[PDB]
Amino acid sequence: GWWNASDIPAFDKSKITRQLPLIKVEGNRFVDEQGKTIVFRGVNISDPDKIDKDKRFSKKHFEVIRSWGANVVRVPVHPRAWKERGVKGYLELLDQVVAWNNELGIYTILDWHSIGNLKSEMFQNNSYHTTKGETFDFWRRVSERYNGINSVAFYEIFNEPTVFNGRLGIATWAEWKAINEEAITIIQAHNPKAIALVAGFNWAYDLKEAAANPIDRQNIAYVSHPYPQKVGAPYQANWERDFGFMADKYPVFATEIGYQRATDKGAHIPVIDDGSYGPRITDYFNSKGISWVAWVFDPDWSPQLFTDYQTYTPTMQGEHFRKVMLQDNK
């Protein structure tokens, strides 16, 4: 594993030729060098490990992302792929995504893509299995190697915290705050410009517990994954109550949203919807200044943003998020 990893090279500086502007948090906003507010709207790729196995791992794929108007790309590093490639093999993919995004002008979010209760080591399935030690070691290596590369602006500590109603144990917000604080200290000690993205429970949906007892670190923003079936009923009023109101105080980065019909490929709760969710959520996010990232720019993982690699034809949700990214990104 990670505890074996022998002499990993440093990032190859010759792979990039420009420095994107520095992003930072100021009160509830992301701002640039000049103090201008920046709202990010982007896509998740699938795991670089899958893209490479698909024989699609080249700059071309990221150039398509750029033509869809995205100004950020989230990279979901699965602990299973990190173990299968090994640290050295995996960093060879990850350095290429970082370099490509950098040359295309696109910011990167590094996402440690597990689901469940890290404190008790119970995960939604083995694809996500890790440990506190492996997670800290990952944050330590990536914050060390990408230090000073401004496009690597966001470090998303742990994709979706959930206890699944006790099926995955017990972990209070207080205990999850302390774990995020240690990860943030590691990351900031390697990379002082790093912005950490922190999530709460119900699969990174809730921010009420965070609001009542916020992470004690600076330059932090908060995550929500408000998929179509997280709540029904009056949608906006429910979203505002569960996580949206947080955006009046800290920036909120909604690092997954997506939807597809009951009959679409891989359709599953909570992503099923007639289609009215797309306009409704990007309007609501515009009303709150909330950044977001659609899931997933891949033709297999569900819900898909496009139908196949031959054409990159957008699906229903792809068409809508592409139109809004082209139109609203500044």
Ligand X SMILES: OC[C@H]1O[C@@H](O[C@H]2[C@H](O)[C@@H](O)[C@H](O[C@H]3[C@H](O)[C@@H](O)[C@H](O[C@H]4[C@H](O)[C@@H](O)[C@H](O)O[C@@H]4CO)O[C@@H]3CO)O[C@@H]2CO)[C@H](O)[C@@H](O)[C@@H]1O
Query: Which residues form the interface with ligand X (CB under 6 A)?
Result: 78, 115, 159-160, 203, 225, 227, 230, 256, 266, 269-271, 295, 301-302
CB of 51 to ligand X, least distance (A): 13
CB nearer to ligand X: pick between 10 and 233: 233
Residue nearer to ligand X on the CB measure, 135 or 191: 135
CB of 93 to ligand X, least distance (A): 16
> Smallest distance from the beta carbon of 301 to ligand X, in angstroms?
4
Q: Which two tokens stand for residue 63?
A: 């150039």
User: Could you tell me which of 176, 76, 167 has the C-alpha nearest to residue 124?
Assistant: 167
Closest distance to ligand X from the beta carbon of 46 (Å): 7
Least spacing, CB of residue 312 vs ligand X, in Å: 18
- Give φ, ψ of 74 to 5 degrees: -95, 135
Give the shortest CB-3-to-ligand X separation in angstroms.
24
> Which lies closer to ligand X via its Cβ, residue 15 or residue 268?
268
**Distance (Å, whole) CA 161 – CA 199:** 7
CB of 160 to ligand X, least distance (A): 5
Nearer to ligand X, 1 or 266 (CB): 266
- 8 Å CB contact between 60 and 318: no
If phi > 0 it is left, if psi is from -120 to 50 it is alpha, else beta; for residue 5 that is: beta
- Taking the least distance from each CB to ligand X, the nearer of 227 and 277 is 227
Question: Residue 168 in contact with residue 123, Cβ under 8 Å?
Answer: yes
Q: Judged by CB, which is closer to ligand X: 137, or 206?
A: 206
**Dist CA 180 CA 191 (whole Å):** 16
Strand order in 37-38's β-sheet?
24-26, 29-31, 37-38
Phi/psi of residue 86, each to 5°? Answer: 75, 165
Q: How far is the CB of 86 from ligand X (least distance, A)?
A: 20
